[PDB]
């Protein structure tokens, strides 16, 4: 209520958003330069990439939308939710198939078939991405269909939306966090498994592994409860606490982004 | 290396048949595969031809869609699947080697063929010269022309020469018009540029009796000369 | 007698490359500049070839 | 514009680049193992009882749905700071240490241990600056020997400052602390000790599940977790 | 006995060193004080050649400027053809342990070597299109580090024995055997008229050797680590040796004392490989900083810095014609690097 208090979380959410767009930036522009050095990236640079392009667009919608909202400045493209949702789709796509992609190199079986399987993902990666993308617009479209009726209006119909949308989310949702604890139980099963073969740089590599997971796992999911209270905000705290809840999600969003920071091997190994 | 063939013979019109060339001696892999035919009394032309690893298979378009050829690595061998015969498909059948890569001898070696007789855009090369005589120890040219010029942007010429003296298969004499091949007398020699060019034989054997042909390779429905033949 | 021998072969070594004909370094870097400078058109690598006749673009 | 052989040969080239990428997934599936020590310190007994029945001695062997390289470099007499460098990227560098040859002096020189020309050869190899991350799996070899050597002579004579007491786990679990003391950069090597069992089986075992744990490390430095 | 060689070794190398003082009058920096800079030469990297899944160790011109051949630890000797990027062969090395490979003259064979101590002659030209080790020549007991192919039938390969060989191809035995170098060979280069070769070893020395009457002709030293490269000067009375010191050193046969040093307080690494160009004025040597340098062999100026890979500059090579220059390095990429008019 207070105009300080809106001032202050206001000038914190355009430096999150800042910080946001300079990180993806930088890291479209190691990581493109990079690849079209190489012409070939390991898995995690190639998804880094494809969520920074995805953090960096959702970031510049997110900021087109709040302030389109908050100073009821109406526009042709201030009011952009279909493609901020589209690319929080991307996003959370991006980061289970990162999840996904831990699961698969970290874990040590000797399976023939799931070996197989493997390979198949290091070879058609790319390929990997590119399903993703088509995917996250494909379960998109149901929010578009929704958008375009309700400005036609402009019930069953709020129903329907509200279901697209959380579906749209929490799919990826739970591969994520499927692949997540999966992981943290083969790590915590190395780690316990040991005995008289001690090895102590290796132990500490699987707790830094754990820890990270751990940081990545907290922020994730506390992103998603908080665009699921958005998505419920229908029936929860009124958005006029914009300027609070907006920093809120984005201070997540900016933990998340700085982890996937500390977690890019090329961009450690360039610097 | 050995091109031996197998398949052929009397067929009725309208039918169906199978010519296999069974490689040895060599990599078949990596060597691609041609399939030639000669009319029983006339010159060559170009009927099939398969890459290394079946990526691209070409056809003659008088042969479109009635053949297929195919190969089969593990077993080393060259189908060529003939279905709907008409009259002119009675002829003297070749397989050919072929690998394709700088500095290579594209159509080096040739199989023995198989007979098949049947109960009754292109670039075009023209050979006037047709029948000369010849004495052994003089010095003769034969002259091939092209419809269009061969000289492709890279810097070749892409001529194929190739000598067959009576009784069996040809061979090659000069590859890219000016390259001398590997096994032949060096009397042999190619020269010319643009669209008219000659090969000459600085002396006369008693084995270099026989027909000439020249081939180009520039677009690939190759079209064989119509053949200049020496003899005593 | 091992190193005695491998001492004899050593001065026998220097005592067959103290004998060569030596010149004056100044005639050897005349002559040393002078391959510089007769083949300098000769090379592309330090006057740049016209691009038509370059081979690699 | 292409002509069409020089069509043919991009196919012949494309071709050959995927018999390149096979064989370099294959290749790139393979554990090599560099192994490297002093001479006669169990190098030989060593290679044969995990092959499980000049120049570099590849030894190839399967444990587990594994390949492992083994590239013995012994024969080579010249400075190995010259081709060490080739080395860089093995998965792992097991190190072979004749734990009886803590009396016997060098032939060649007899003013240096042949425990101390380990010693040395071990901080080279350790410290080299092209295996600042190569894990290493050290065998002490001859084990049934020092369990009766000790009995007679003492680690005086190898190793002056020992507290005392010449029985076999003290003296092992000294000659293993001051190997590992070696490692300057702990905590990014390992130096995975095993006491090989010359009548029994499990050596090639242990080497799998270090191979295995130096794998697993590398993929989480891949990932970017660690 | 002992004492008294030694004193008259020390004796004769005192006075090879007054005779090399007295014949240094005034070296060749004051003799090109005047001389035209080369300017700033600046590189594009016309084409990449990409394929080799390991470091690239070695790397030779074919005669004809177009055809390369590059060897890397993945066990695959690779001949490209640089004009269109194609790759002609990938040979599959017995041994993954390459460091050394060579073009023949004629190009119908290819020369590997590496730490098997076997040289391995490779026949391109065959009837069966597969390339097949012709030769293995067997006979070094130490890593083979340079290979050079005379006549299609004799081949000089250096290797870790201190020790140089000429090989007879076709019977496959050691004709004459070149030694006298204290530390180990790492690098060989041939003269244009083939009738000497120089190497360079471990023992910071250069030694010329006459090839047919196989003893040491000539040894240079000056160097204060171990020599990684040899080149010989096109003109055939030069070369220029690249060591671990940051320094390229070049000595001329007819004055053995050397005639310049290139170095730089910026540069510390090593340099890996040394090439000269046809006219001799350039003289390309990679360095251990991901990026190789072309200095100005008269003027001892850095020219220009070819920064384009993301690991040490492994082999150097120069076309016979002076219309390209083949970067091959670590980041198993071999990089064609030409000027821009
Ligand atoms: O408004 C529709 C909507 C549905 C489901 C998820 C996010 C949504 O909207 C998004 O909410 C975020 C959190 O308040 C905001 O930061 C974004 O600007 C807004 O587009």
């Not at chain 1, 209270?229 to 998340?256: N, P, Q, S």
């Not at chain 2, 942007?153 to 090659?172: C, E, I, K, V």
């Not at chain 3, 005349?30 to 690598?45: I, Q, T, V, W």
């Not at chain 5, 001892?300 to 390209?324: E, F, I, K, Y």
Request: proline share 2%; charged share 20%; aromatic share 10%.
């Amino acid at each position: 209520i207070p105009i300080q208090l809106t001032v202050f979380f206001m000038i914190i959410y355009v430096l999150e958003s800042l910080t946001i767009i300079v990180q993806s930036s930088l890291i479209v522009a190691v990581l493109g330069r990079e690849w079209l050095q190489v012409r070939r990236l390991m898995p995690v640079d190639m998804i880094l990439i494809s969520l920074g392009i995805s953090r960096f667009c959702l970031q510049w919608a997110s900021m087109l939308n709040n302030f389109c909202s908050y100073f009821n400045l109406n526009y042709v493209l201030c009011n952009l939710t279909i493609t901020w949702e589209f690319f929080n789709i991307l996003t959370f796509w991006l980061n289970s198939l990162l999840t996904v992609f831990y699961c698969i190199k970290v874990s040590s079986f000797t399976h023939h078939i799931f070996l197989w399987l493997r390979w198949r993902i290091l070879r058609l990666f790319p390929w990997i991405l590119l399903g993703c993308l088509m995917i996250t617009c494909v379960t998109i479209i149901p929010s578009a269909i929704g958008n375009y009726i309700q400005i036609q209006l402009l019930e069953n119909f709020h129903q329907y939306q509200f279901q697209a949308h959380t579906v749209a989310l929490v799919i990826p949702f739970i591969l994520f966090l499927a692949s997540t604890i999966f992981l943290m139980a083969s790590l915590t099963k190395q780690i316990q498994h040991h005995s008289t073969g001690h090895c102590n740089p290796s132990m500490k590599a699987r707790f830094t592994a754990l820890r990270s997971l751990a940081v990545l796992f907290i922020v994730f999911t506390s992103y998603f409860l908080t665009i699921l209270i958005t998505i419920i905000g229908t029936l929860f705290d009124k958005r006029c606490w914009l300027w609070v809840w907006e920093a809120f999600v984005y201070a997540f969003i900016l933990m998340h982004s700085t982890s996937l920071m500390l977690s890019s091997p090329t961009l450690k190994r360039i610097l | 290396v050995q091109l031996v063939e197998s398949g052929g013979g009397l067929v009725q019109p309208g039918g169906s048949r199978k010519l296999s060339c069974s490689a040895s001696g060599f990599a078949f892999s990596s060597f691609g595969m041609h399939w030639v035919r000669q009319a029983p009394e006339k010159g060559l032309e170009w009927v099939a031809y398969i890459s290394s690893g079946s990526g691209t298979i070409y056809y003659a378009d008088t042969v479109k869609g009635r053949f297929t050829i195919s190969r089969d690595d593990p077993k080393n061998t060259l189908f060529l699947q003939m279905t709907s015969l008409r009259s002119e498909d009675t002829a003297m059948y070749y397989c050919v080697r072929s690998i394709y890569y700088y500095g290579s001898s594209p159509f080096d070696f040739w199989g023995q063929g198989t007979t098949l007789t049947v109960s009754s855009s292109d670039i075009v090369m023209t050979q006037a010269t047709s029948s000369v005589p010849v004495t052994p120890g003089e010095s003769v040219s034969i002259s091939c022309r092209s419809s269009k010029s061969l000289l492709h942007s890279n810097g070749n010429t892409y001529l194929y020469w190739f000598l067959q003296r009576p009784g069996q298969s040809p061979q090659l004499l000069i590859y890219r018009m000016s390259n001398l091949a590997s096994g032949v007398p060096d009397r042999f020699s190619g020269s010319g540029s643009g669209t008219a060019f000659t090969l000459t034989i600085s002396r006369l054997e008693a084995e270099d009796v026989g027909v000439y042909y020249c081939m180009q390779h520039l677009e690939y429905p190759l079209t064989f000369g119509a053949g200049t033949k020496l003899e005593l | 007698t091992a190193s005695i021998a491998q001492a004899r072969k050593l001065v026998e070594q220097l005592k067959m490359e103290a004998n060569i004909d030596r010149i004056k370094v100044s005639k050897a870097a005349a002559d040393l500049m002078a391959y510089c400078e007769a083949h300098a058109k000769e090379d592309p690598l330090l006057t740049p070839v016209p691009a038509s006749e370059n081979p690699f673009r | 514009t292409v002509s069409a052989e020089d069509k043919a040969a991009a196919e012949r080239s494309k071709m050959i680049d995927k018999n390149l990428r096979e064989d370099g997934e294959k290749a790139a599936r393979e554990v090599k193992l560099l192994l490297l020590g002093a001479g006669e310190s169990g190098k030989n007994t060593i290679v044969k009882q995990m092959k499980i029945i000049t120049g570099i001695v590849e030894t190839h062997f399967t444990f587990k749905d594994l390949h492992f390289k083994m590239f013995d470099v012994g024969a080579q007499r010249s400075e190995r700071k010259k081709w060490i460098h080739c080395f860089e990227g093995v998965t792992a560098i097991i190190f072979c240490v004749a734990l009886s040859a803590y009396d016997l002096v060098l032939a060649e020189d007899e003013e240096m241990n042949r425990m101390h020309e380990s010693m040395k050869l071990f901080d080279s190899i350790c410290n080299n600056k092209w295996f600042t991350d190569t894990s290493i799996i050290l065998f002490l070899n001859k084990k049934d020997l020092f369990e009766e050597k000790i009995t007679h002579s003492p680690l005086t004579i190898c190793f002056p400052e020992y507290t005392g007491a010449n029985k076999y786990d003290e003296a092992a679990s000294y000659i293993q602390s001051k190997f590992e003391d070696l490692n300057k950069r702990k905590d990014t090597k390992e130096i995975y000790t095993h006491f090989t069992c010359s009548t029994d089986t499990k050596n090639v075992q242990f080497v799998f599940d270090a191979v295995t744990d130096v794998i697993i490390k590398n993929n989480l430095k891949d990932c970017g977790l660690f | 006995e002992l004492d008294q060689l030694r004193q008259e070794a020390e004796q004769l190398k005192n006075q090879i060193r007054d005779a090399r003082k007295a014949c240094a009058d005034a070296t060749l920096s004051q003799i090109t004080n005047n001389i035209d800079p080369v300017g700033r030469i600046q590189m594009r990297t016309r084409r990449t050649l990409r394929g080799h899944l390991a470091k690239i160790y070695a790397m030779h011109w074919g005669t004809d400027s177009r055809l390369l051949v590059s060897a890397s630890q993945d066990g695959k000797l690779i001949i490209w053809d640089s004009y269109t990027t194609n790759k002609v062969h990938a040979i599959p090395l017995r041994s993954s342990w390459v460091m050394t490979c060579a073009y023949a003259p004629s190009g119908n064979y290819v020369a590997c070597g590496g730490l098997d101590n076997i040289c391995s002659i490779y026949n391109l030209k065959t009837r069966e299109g597969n390339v097949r080790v012709s030769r293995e020549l067997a006979g070094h007991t130490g890593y083979l580090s340079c290979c050079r192919f005379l006549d299609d039938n004799q081949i000089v390969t250096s290797s870790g024995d201190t020790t140089c060989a000429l090989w007879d191809i076709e019977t496959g035995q050691q004709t004459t055997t070149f030694t006298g170098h204290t530390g180990d060979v790492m690098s060989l280069s041939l003269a244009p008229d083939t009738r000497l070769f120089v190497s360079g070893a471990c023992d910071a020395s250069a030694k010329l050797w006459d090839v047919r009457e196989g003893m040491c002709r000539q040894t240079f030293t000056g160097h204060e680590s171990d020599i990684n490269a040899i080149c010989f000067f096109p003109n055939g009375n030069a070369f220029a040796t690249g060591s671990d010191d940051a320094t390229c050193r070049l000595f001329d046969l007819r004055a053995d004392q050397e005639l310049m040093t290139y170095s730089h307080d910026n540069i510390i690494c090593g340099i890996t490989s040394v090439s000269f160009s046809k006219s001799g004025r350039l003289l390309l040597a990679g360095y251990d900083d991901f990026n190789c340098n072309v200095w100005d062999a008269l003027k001892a100026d850095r020219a220009g810095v070819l920064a384009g890979h993301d690991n040490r500059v492994s082999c150097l090579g120069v076309t016979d014609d002076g219309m390209a220059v083949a970067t091959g390095s670590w980041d198993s990429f071999l990089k064609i690097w030409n000027g821009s008019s």
